[PDB]
């Protein structure tokens, strides 16, 4: 049967005070399997299920550094969207990203996902073709023009058709 992997990432700026709280949660077949929380005593990705303890320290170190980079990305882009929506600084805002893959019995990519939401509203989403973008409003059209010119869709497609499927199968084997 089919299988799926998804990551949901959120960053929340509270009252503009300090660093956004960043969280990332991964799911395989609708089961949470890893998780990162910036508010933890020492922020690292942690296994949420016993079959993930099969991965060595290098795996954890690596994906933790990916989380570290993502924190910065979310910081910068929260600021950018404050700009696009002409909102005053000092407020509370959330930026979310969901991405991942569905694969068939065949073990091949059935559908990829890469999509972003701001303050609980759709912002920009990669279409099923993994080539074109749905922009939810006029602000998101700015990003879409930039992303069409930068080949962002190809960038995400490289992960969705490569790493995403491979890792999903590795985790299905681990489980």
């Amino acid at each position: 049967g089919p299988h799926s992997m998804r990551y949901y990432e959120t960053a929340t700026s509270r009252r503009g005070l300090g660093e956004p709280r960043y969280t990332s949660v991964g799911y395989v077949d609708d089961k949470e399997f890893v998780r990162f929380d910036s508010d933890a005593e020492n922020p690292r990705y942690e296994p949420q299920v016993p079959w993930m303890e099969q991965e060595g320290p290098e795996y954890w170190e690596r994906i933790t550094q990916i989380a570290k980079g993502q924190e910065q990305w979310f910081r910068v882009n929260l600021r950018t969207l404050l700009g696009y929506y002409n909102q005053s600084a000092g407020g509370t805002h959330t930026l979310q990203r969901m991405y991942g893959c569905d694969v068939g019995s065949d073990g091949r990519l059935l559908r990829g996902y890469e999509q972003f939401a701001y303050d609980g509203c759709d912002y920009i989403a990669l279409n099923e073709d993994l080539r074109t973008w749905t922009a939810a409003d006029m602000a998101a059209q700015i990003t879409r023009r930039k992303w069409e010119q930068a080949g962002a869709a190809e960038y995400y497609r490289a992960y969705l058709e490569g790493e995403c499927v491979e890792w999903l199968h590795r985790y299905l084997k681990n489980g």
Binding site: G26, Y45, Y59, I66, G69, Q70, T80, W147, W167
Partner: peptide, 9 residues
């Protein structure tokens, strides 16, 4: 394994 968003809004 998670991925980078990379591209700026």
């Amino acid at each position: 394994s998670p991925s980078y968003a990379y591209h700026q809004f």
